[PDB]
Amino acid sequence: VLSEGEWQLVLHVWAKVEADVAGHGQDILIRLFKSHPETLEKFDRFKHLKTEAEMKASEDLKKHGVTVLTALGAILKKKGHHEAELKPLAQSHATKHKIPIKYLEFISEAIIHVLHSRHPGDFGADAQGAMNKALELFRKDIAAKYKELGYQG
Numbered sequence: 001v002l003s004e005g006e007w008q009l010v011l012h013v014w015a016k017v018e019a020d021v022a023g024h025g026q027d028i029l030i031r032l033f034k035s036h037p038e039t040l041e042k043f044d045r046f047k048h049l050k051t052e053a054e055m056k057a058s059e060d061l062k063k064h065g066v067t068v069l070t071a072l073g074a075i076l077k078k079k080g081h082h083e084a085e086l087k088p089l090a091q092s093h094a095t096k097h098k099i100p101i102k103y104l105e106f107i108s109e110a111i112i113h114v115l116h117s118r119h120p121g122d123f124g125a126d127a128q129g130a131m132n133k134a135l136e137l138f139r140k141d142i143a144a145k146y147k148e149l150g151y152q153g
């Protein structure tokens with residue numbers, strides 16, 4: 001359970017992401033894909049991208065980054081009352097896209113990285129800890145729905 005203080009740190013930094021959702025979305029997906037190449041293989045859409053330059057030139061990758069961050073933003077702004085928003089996301093990522101929970105850990109790390117790079121004055125250690133807790137809560141609750149469906153492993 002995050003506290004109200006910790007939610008405020010999280011959503012203070014997130015409001016700054018909302019000024020440039022596409023740029024953030026691109027940097028995070030590129031970092032995920034470079035740090036953890038296995039994750040790119042889950043996207044038939046992107047698996048032709050062999051260089052960081054080709055990834056940064058891809059409009060379709062930048063489109064997907066906005067889709068991911070708008071959905072994450074929607075869940076963060078529920079401050080933990082996010083069951084309606086997580087159900088479909090867990091359902092599709094377990095059963096259709098086949099994404100292990102650990103790759104959700106990876107993209108959490110890439111999101112923390114990108115926010116520290118772009119918003120260092122709003123993303124000190126308090127706010128880093130709080131964002132980590134929010135992202136853990138997202139992963140806990142998706143993992144519980146994986147388990148229900150037979151995909152926690």
Ligand code: HEM
Nearest residue numbers: 039042043045067068071072088089092097099103104107
């Ligand atoms: C913050 C974590 C994430 C969020 C909020 C998220 C959000 C989304 C949304 C909103 C969609 C499209 C709607 C849907 O299919 O449910 C999507 C599609 C997809 N996601 Fe995620 N995603 C996350 C993490 C990941 C990770 C870690 C992977 C892969 C490693 C991944 C792989 C996919 C794939 C393969 C699609 C289908 C893309 C396509 O071919 O159109 N997701 N995601």
